[PDB]
Amino acid sequence: RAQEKVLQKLGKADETKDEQFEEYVQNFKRQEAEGTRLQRELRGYLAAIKGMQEASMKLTESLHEVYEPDWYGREDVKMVGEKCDVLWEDFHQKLVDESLLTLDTYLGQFPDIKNRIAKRSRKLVDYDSARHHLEALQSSKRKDESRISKAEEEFQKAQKVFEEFNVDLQEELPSLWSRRVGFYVNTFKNVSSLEAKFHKEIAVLCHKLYEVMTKLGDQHA
Amino acid sequence: RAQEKVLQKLGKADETKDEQFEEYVQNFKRQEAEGTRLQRELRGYLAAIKGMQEASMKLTESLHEVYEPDWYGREDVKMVGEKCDVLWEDFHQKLVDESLLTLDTYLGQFPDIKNRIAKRSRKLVDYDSARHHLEALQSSKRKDESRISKAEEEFQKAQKVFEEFNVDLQEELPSLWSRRVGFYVNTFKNVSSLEAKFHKEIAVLCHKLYEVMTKLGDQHA
């Protein structure tokens, strides 16, 4: 350093880079909170799907139970009930195995990053301390070479250790932030495609039940 | 009566008719229990529909909230959410106003019938008692005309009062039992037709969401 003020300029640059990094961390926290909220709501949706499945089944069971042997369509009602339950079961399971699983694995990458952010902060405090200490030693009236040399080693090491954590996270945080859209797109492509298909397939069975009831009605006219 | 054994033969016929009536009452009880069970399950189904509606809405709300201004399709996502909620709202309400209301009114006819069945039983005990009493008076060693005449009036009245309740319920119970099928047919025609239509209409919106997500995905490719 010396009269080129190298370490002082280093500190200024480090501070500007750290301000940018704290902006990344704010986005990272927002991204985690958004993901966890989506997880809660997707889980809520799955539980509502299952509730629908079960309530629908009981309803068709109760119809099959009031049926008389002579009534048209008893076996068709049973089959409608069975096929509908399979549709619900598969729809729920495919949502679990796609959108939910993918979201859980996406969220699974956050705790390790949070731990390395924590380590980076601590290592920055050590690096900051070593830089200031070296600056002080280099500007003193007494010039103690053995003392300065050791402070140089300590500064070089603290810097290396900090920058290891820093350069990785400087890459990883904005990249993870960028992947946000692809993650939401794929989650909702999965939800919407499975649901579209489910609604189309179950309509066929609703129509079959209507048809059976029409014929039962006609039989008893 | 006298030596033609009129009152004794009357009692035999009354007993055979009463055995048939008790068979009607068993069916009536079964019919009420079937209806109440169907009411419970239909209510359960409606509550599951509402749960689905609400859980679906939160899910789309959370998507709209993560959206960035530059992202394709923000207004389309909002509109999908709004239109889906209207579909759910109307589907639930039409089920309330048709199948549920109709079932509630159908079940509403049972308590008055149960009360008249109760009255009939009591009036049958009085009628039974008056018939036996008249039989006893008519066969006695002492023939007391003023006594017999009064017992005749009491028998005639108790019979009239019983038969008022009896002939109505003898008509109403099998008729109500016969209406069972039409009631189940109309309940499930309503449920299945509304659901078929709902599933068809909401599939369109699921496809719209998939389309928007596809274009959002493409935009960020």
Chain B residues with CB-CB distance to A95 below 8 A: none
Cα–Cα distance measured from residue A202 to residue A199, given in angstroms and rounded to the nearest whole number? 5
Question: In the structure encoding, which two tokens stand for residue B211, read together?
Answer: 């389309």
Look at residues A217, A8, A104 and name the one whose alpha carbon lies nearest to residue B182. Answer: A217
The C-alpha of A172 sits at a distance from chain B's nearest C-alpha, in angstroms, of 19
What is the interface size between A and B, counted as CB pairs within 8 Å? 150
Q: How many domains does the structure of chain A reveal?
A: 1
**CATH number of the domain where residue B49 is located:** 1.20.1270.60
Cα–Cα distance measured from residue A78 to residue A84, given in angstroms and rounded to the nearest whole number? 10
Question: In the structure encoding, which two tokens stand for residue B32, read together?
Answer: 């009420």
Question: In the structure encoding, which two tokens stand for residue B56, read together?
Answer: 């679906």
B62 touches chain A (CB under 8 A): yes
Cα–Cα distance measured from residue A99 to residue A103, given in angstroms and rounded to the nearest whole number? 6
Cα–Cα distance measured from residue B92 to residue B49, given in angstroms and rounded to the nearest whole number? 7
In angstroms, the Cα distances linking B149 to A116, B1, B9, B145 are 109, 13, 20, 6
Chain A residues with CB-CB distance to B47 below 8 A: 55
Decide: residue B38, CB within 10 A, 0-12 exposed, 13-18 middle, 19+ buried: buried
Cα–Cα distance measured from residue A53 to residue A87, given in angstroms and rounded to the nearest whole number? 9
**Contact call for residues B144 and B137 (beta carbons, < 8 A):** yes
Residues 6+ apart with CB under 8 A from B103: B35, B38, B39, B42, B183, B187
Question: In the structure encoding, which two tokens stand for residue B91, read together?
Answer: 């589907």
Decide: residue A24, CB within 10 A, 0-12 exposed, 13-18 middle, 19+ buried: middle
Which residue in chain B has the smallest CA separation from A48?
Answer: B52
Sign of the torsion formed by the C-alpha atoms of B85, B86, B91 and B95: positive
Sign of the torsion formed by the C-alpha atoms of B11, B15, B18 and B20: negative
**Contact call for residues A157 and A125 (beta carbons, < 8 A):** no
Sign of the torsion formed by the C-alpha atoms of B65, A102, A45 and A210: positive
Cα–Cα distance measured from residue B43 to residue B189, given in angstroms and rounded to the nearest whole number? 17
The one-letter code for the residue type at B204 is V
Partner B, chain A 26-45, Cβ-Cβ below 8 Å: 34, 37-38, 41-42, 44-45
**Contact call for residues A110 and A180 (beta carbons, < 8 A):** no
Cα–Cα distance measured from residue A209 to residue B141, given in angstroms and rounded to the nearest whole number? 72
B64 touches chain A (CB under 8 A): no
Cα–Cα distance measured from residue A218 to residue B193, given in angstroms and rounded to the nearest whole number? 17
B70 touches chain A (CB under 8 A): no
Chain A residues with CB-CB distance to B196 below 8 A: 203, 206-207, 210
Cα–Cα distance measured from residue A135 to residue B80, given in angstroms and rounded to the nearest whole number? 62
Determine, for residues B44 and A62 on separate chains, whether the beta-carbon distance falls below 8 Å: no
Among A80, A189, A202, A215, the residue to mutate for chain B (most B Cβ within 10 A): A189
Cα–Cα distance measured from residue B206 to residue B129, given in angstroms and rounded to the nearest whole number? 72
Decide: residue B185, CB within 10 A, 0-12 exposed, 13-18 middle, 19+ buried: buried
Look at residues A177, A175, A169 and name the one whose alpha carbon lies nearest to residue A18. Answer: A169
Look at residues B209, B202, B54 and name the one whose alpha carbon lies nearest to residue A184. Answer: B209
B209 touches chain A (CB under 8 A): yes
Chain A residues with CB-CB distance to B39 below 8 A: none
Q: How many CB atoms lie within 10 A of CB A146?
A: 7
Sign of the torsion formed by the C-alpha atoms of A53, A54, A59 and A63: positive
Tell me the structure's resolution in angstroms, rounded to a single decimal: 1.8
Cα–Cα distance measured from residue B36 to residue B107, given in angstroms and rounded to the nearest whole number? 7
Cα–Cα distance measured from residue B156 to residue B135, given in angstroms and rounded to the nearest whole number? 13
Secondary structure in 3-state letters for chain A: CHHHCHHHHHHHHHHHHHHHHHHHHHHHHHHHHHHHHHHHHHHHHHHHHHHHHHHHHHHHHHHHHHCCCCCCCHHHHHHHHHHHHHHHHHHHHHHHHHHHHHHHHHHHCHHHHHHHHHHHHHHHHHHHHHHHHHHHHHCCCCCCHHHHHHHHHHHHHHHHHHHHHHHHHHHHHHHHHHCHHHHHHHHHHHHHHHHHHHHHHHHHHHHHHHHHHHHHHHHCC
Question: In the structure encoding, which two tokens stand for residue A30, read together?
Answer: 């927002």
Among A199, A211, A218, the residue to mutate for chain B (most B Cβ within 10 A): A199
Cα–Cα distance measured from residue A158 to residue A154, given in angstroms and rounded to the nearest whole number? 6
Look at residues B144, B124, B122, B120 and name the one whose alpha carbon lies nearest to residue B134. Answer: B144
Question: In the structure encoding, which two tokens stand for residue A59, read together?
Answer: 């309803």
Cα–Cα distance measured from residue B50 to residue B88, given in angstroms and rounded to the nearest whole number? 8
Sign of the torsion formed by the C-alpha atoms of B65, B68, B74 and B77: negative
Q: What is the C-alpha end-to-end distance of chain A, expressed in Å? A: 103
**Contact call for residues A185 and B213 (beta carbons, < 8 A):** yes
Cα–Cα distance measured from residue B102 to residue B194, given in angstroms and rounded to the nearest whole number? 15
**Contact call for residues A56 and B188 (beta carbons, < 8 A):** no
**Contact call for residues B174 and B26 (beta carbons, < 8 A):** no
The DSSP secondary-structure symbol of B100 reads: I
Determine, for residues A59 and B44 on separate chains, whether the beta-carbon distance falls below 8 Å: yes
Sign of the torsion formed by the C-alpha atoms of A49, A50, A54 and A60: positive
Cα–Cα distance measured from residue B88 to residue B95, given in angstroms and rounded to the nearest whole number? 11
Cα–Cα distance measured from residue A200 to residue A196, given in angstroms and rounded to the nearest whole number? 6
Residue B48's domain spans which residues?
1-221
Of B45, B206, B210, the CB nearest to A55: B45
> Inter-axis angle of helices A145-178 and A110-138, to 10 degrees?
150
Look at residues A76, A59, A85 and name the one whose alpha carbon lies nearest to residue A210. Answer: A76
